[PDB]
Amino acid sequence: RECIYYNANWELERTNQSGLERCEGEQDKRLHCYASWRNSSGTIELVKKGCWLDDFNCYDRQECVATEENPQVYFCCCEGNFCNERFTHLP
Amino acid sequence: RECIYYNANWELERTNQSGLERCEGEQDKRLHCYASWRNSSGTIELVKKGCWLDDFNCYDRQECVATEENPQVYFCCCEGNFCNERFTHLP
Amino acid sequence: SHCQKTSLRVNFEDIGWDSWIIAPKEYEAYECKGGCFFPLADDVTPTKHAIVQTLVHLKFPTKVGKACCVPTKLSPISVLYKDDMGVPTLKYHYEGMSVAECGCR
Amino acid sequence: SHCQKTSLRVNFEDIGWDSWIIAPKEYEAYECKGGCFFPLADDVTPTKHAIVQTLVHLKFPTKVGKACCVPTKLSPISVLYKDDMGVPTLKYHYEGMSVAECGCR
Amino acid sequence: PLVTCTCESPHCKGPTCRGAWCTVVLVREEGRHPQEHRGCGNLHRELCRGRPTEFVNHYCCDSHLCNHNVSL
Amino acid sequence: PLVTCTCESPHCKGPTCRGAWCTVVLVREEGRHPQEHRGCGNLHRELCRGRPTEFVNHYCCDSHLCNHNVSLVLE
């Protein structure tokens, strides 16, 4: 089970910048992928992408989609290898 | 911290017969020695001697003495190296 | 009435953690609800002590209490939270926030 | 008072183990008595979960319960007992019969 | 070396179960009248040696289905 | 890198205590009026970030004796 890794703040946090991640996880628990980005009126700045743990909000959701109305940080999770490659918004 | 080891039933239980024992014990817990024997009207048959774990009945007791009135099996514990070499009875 | 794992949707806003947890907004921690009733089912992992206490309680139900139903194993969850300087960062293995297994102790 | 370790002299005769425990006749198991009251003292080893649950309970004291005070570490005791064929034999490390440390879970 | 026991109890996923040995246990809880469960057991053999008290009776055996025709 | 805090609470073995940081915490348990403890803390820094709710207020700081002249509210 794999996800898209990305971390804009990499230099600062001393981590890789972009790539992929194999998800370490509990025996009979589910695994997920996440993406999060900022949105300054249409201009999209990526913030982080990567693996995410058995959280029911992502349960059986094929595409990575954010649901919040108007957030500081947009967030979305999903289930299925590399499902976080592309992401979108719709409350 | 050491005790007198003895096990009449040794052959049967596949263990040494007589000797001594160094007491494996918890960091800040106390250690003790025990003895137990049968008493068929004055005739004393030994049954077991050895290490015994932090049990308050033995707390700060110099000699190995049994306290029960008239028991099937006489038992006694104590605190202090080889305190179970000799033992006695008095309810 | 028996001892088991229960749903507990904690909402971070409810406990005022919305201030620094960006996601999720709520998550499944579980609850350990129910009584430890004799005899103690194997799937409750009873400790020797739990057994003994339980017995003693059967004899002194006013002086000694039943064993308690508690989380015995704990899964972590993932959370995206604001840095000390307001940077979205991620604890992927945020330890001990959700109930894995329940039991009697 | 709060959440703490308490004396519990268990007498094997009382729970009918006098049938096979030759010694001791009674021993100190402890009890874990008391409430897990916010804020949770460090010496109670609160788990994350315990903290969360405690908070949620502060808001929903009727639907969600406090954390329980349970034994968190267990010492063994030594016992001299009758074989399956009535031979005095010894478990030196009889596990989990006495309370070592208490806590909130 | 498992065996099959009758299972009359709340924690019963069926009419019978498999385990290390079979149990019949009589209990007084809660002030209620005594109730009698029958089932499996693989954890604490010692309990069986328990001499019956005024509030509990643990009885065990290890032959097939050996806990049907039996009360206390 | 410990520090010294004022200690007004039940779990207090003295008038002051030492720890990683100092706390002032306000709690409103069902039925009872809110009570305000002051003390140490070394376990769960996160709690401090807690925005104050209708039933609790966690406040922390890390200068010497910094939790005397200081009280709190709810919502």
Ligand SMILES: *[C@@H]1O[C@H](CO)[C@@H](O)[C@H](O)[C@H]1NC(C)=O
């Ligand atoms: C970045 O990723 C590579 C593998 O692609 C790995 O060797 C290295 O440990 C990573 N650097 C980190 C974790 O800082």
Ligand SMILES: *[C@@H]1O[C@H](CO)[C@@H](O)[C@H](O)[C@H]1NC(C)=O
């Ligand atoms: C902001 O970003 C999203 C994509 O993440 C875009 O689809 C949306 O229309 C943008 N504008 C708004 C609603 O602020």
Ligand SMILES: *[C@@H]1O[C@H](CO)[C@@H](O)[C@H](O)[C@H]1NC(C)=O
């Ligand atoms: C008997 O005692 C000796 C040391 O005194 C020890 O080396 C040996 O292992 C003991 N026997 C057994 C099998 O416990």
Ligand SMILES: *[C@H]1O[C@H](CO)[C@@H](O)[C@H](O)[C@H]1NC(C)=O
């Ligand atoms: C049996 O042996 C004990 C142990 O020395 C002795 O003190 C006691 O008097 C004897 N008991 C009787 C009365 O047979």
Ligand code: NA
């Ligand atoms: Na013998």
